[PDB]
Design a protein around this ligand. Structure first.
Ligand SMILES: [Mg+2]
Ligand SMILES: [Mg+2]
Lengths: 216, 216
């Protein structure tokens, strides 16, 4: 139970680790990091990347959200198992989490922080992700099949940003991807997800205010 | 034993999967892909990224080299185990493999394919990787500690390119990082590594000829 999570409230990546901890019914200390004034603990525990989320367990750091989720799953594998038991299914889940990380590394920032050609580039990339994930989900209840799993955790945090993407990047998500909206609604019925995701209007307000200040 | 590996002889990433298969004493079919004329099988099995290496097991694809290595380890966990048994050690091994992938994604190409400012940028990034990995290795025999492990597999393929990096990018590796040279020599004593890594002079000749043709 000796766990600290250094995180940023609106981080879709940190939300993954918040969800995994709640899935295991783990009590932990959440600490909010100021992204423009990172704590001494954060820089000490994540000297390589200096980024949130940072999971600290018995004073030892675990970095990278998908690696944190797997560490939590391996620590408590019998309570709400996150990864599949089958090796091949496991590899597919890791592949799609990796896909999300690779393809959202830039858009996660440029979608709200840029304009013009750099924001258009990010819009194109993110729409491609939504289409690809929508096709991979198909007609299943979850990316994990019949049960909520690793890939669901890997993407559900982005739902809290859909409203922001539609408004600051002139994207159409809710009306174009009803299967993803329905999937998000299924996931939100889990207490872990409901606790982890911030209000989407709060996200938008925060991002708009920041946007409007840094670029007019 | 029903395994096909679609790979490129000089791919340091594909070398990881070659090593993992040999570590498990698995007989498999290796197929060489022409990177400028990718096979129909490759595009079929890896439609998302269209890149090697692609591992095909009972006709099902597994993409991304570090994910392939873990899949092979989980299929045959008792023969030459690659990942640690301890969850925390496991997370650290995954973190350093992820670090290597993230920081070499661009240099793996720009170091030999570019010149001027883009090659200098890649040189700076790769030197930072070598320094960081050298510090993480410390005085241990392997990145995995007392035994060859995931991070060793994740980086040992780059040794076959050290000569190329020194010659085409005017880097100094062998004389600046004796601990990494000694580590590489330890790893090369394993049959899996000796079989997987191509001759470093053959790599250089191939890369120089390609370089000299595409840019004078
Ligand atoms: Mg499951
Ligand atoms: Mg080991």
């Amino acid at each position: 139970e000796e766990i600290i999570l250094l995180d940023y409230w609106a981080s879709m990546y940190g939300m993954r680790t918040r969800i995994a901890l709640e899935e295991k019914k783990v009590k932990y200390e959440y600490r909010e990091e100021d992204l423009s004034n990172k704590s001494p603990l954060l820089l000490q525990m994540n000297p390589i990347h200096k980024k949130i989320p940072v999971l600290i367990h018995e004073g030892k750091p675990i970095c990278e959200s998908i690696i944190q989720v797997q560490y939590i799953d391996e620590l408590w594998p019998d309570t709400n198992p996150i990864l599949p038991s089958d090796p091949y299914q496991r590899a597919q889940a890791r592949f799609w989490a990796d896909y999300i990380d690779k393809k959202t590394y830039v858009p996660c920032k440029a979608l709200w922080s840029e304009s013009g050609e750099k924001q258009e580039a990010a819009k194109i990339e993110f729409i491609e992700v939504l289409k690809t994930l929508d096709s991979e989900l198909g007609d299943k209840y979850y990316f994990g099949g019949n049960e909520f799993g690793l890939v669901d955790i890997a993407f559900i945090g982005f739902y809290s940003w859909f409203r922001t993407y539609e408004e600051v990047a002139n994207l159409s998500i809710v009306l174009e991807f009803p299967k993803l909206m329905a999937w998000a609604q299924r996931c939100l019925k889990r207490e872990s997800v409901a606790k982890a995701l911030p209000d989407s209007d709060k996200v938008l307000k925060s991002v708009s205010d920041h946007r409007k200040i840094i670029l007019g």
